[PDB]
Ligand binder design. Structure first.
Ligand code: HEM
Length: 152
């Protein structure tokens, strides 16, 4: 649950992402894959990537980064009223991709890391607080659907 002022911070930060969605999406996935190499094994189309240089050179990884952040941005713009947008993603990630909630924690922290890396000194403590709360809400509502499905 976020206040109006917190949502305003989230959507202000998101403007930074929308200026370069592919570059942000690429770096988020690279941070996930290099920090948590077990996550790469869930992607049949990226498991061939052995080095970060190959990851950086992969145009399909940048494409998928655009898909991921476009979906997340659509959810964030609903300011919590995201049941219709979130349900299909919860279902596909639990039942088809088999993504444990832990990996959603990993990618949430990766987003925070990338924002500081690309905007050092321009991602203030209030903005980090609000973005963190928004990603916690996203993860918590996914977790509720995971529990319904019995997925661990
Ligand atoms: C912010 C969190 C995430 C968002 C918004 C997101 C979004 C998406 C979307 C929109 C798709 C394509 C449609 C679909 O299959 O539902 C997708 C596919 C997929 N996601 Fe995610 N995802 C997220 C996190 C993760 C994480 C953490 C993992 C694994 C560590 C993951 C694994 C996958 C896989 C394996 C696919 C299929 C890729 C393919 O072969 O095309 N997702 N995701």
């Amino acid at each position: 649950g976020l206040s109006d002022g917190e949502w305003q911070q989230v959507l202000n930060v998101w403007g930074k992402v929308e200026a370069d969605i592919a570059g942000h999406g690429q770096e988020v996935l690279i941070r996930l894959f290099t920090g948590h190499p077990e996550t790469l094994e869930k992607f049949d189309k990226f498991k061939h990537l052995k080095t970060e240089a190959e990851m950086k050179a992969s145009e399909d990884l940048k494409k998928h980064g655009t898909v991921v952040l476009t979906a997340l941005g659509g959810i964030l713009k609903k300011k919590g009223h995201h049941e219709a947008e979130l349900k299909p993603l919860a279902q596909s990630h639990a039942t088809k991709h088999k993504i444990p909630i832990k990996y959603l924690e990993f990618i949430s922290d990766a987003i925070i890391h990338v924002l500081h890396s690309k905007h050092p000194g321009d991602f203030g403590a209030d903005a980090q607080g609000a973005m963190t709360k928004a990603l916690e809400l996203f993860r918590n509502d996914i977790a509720a659907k995971y529990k319904e499905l019995g997925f661990q």
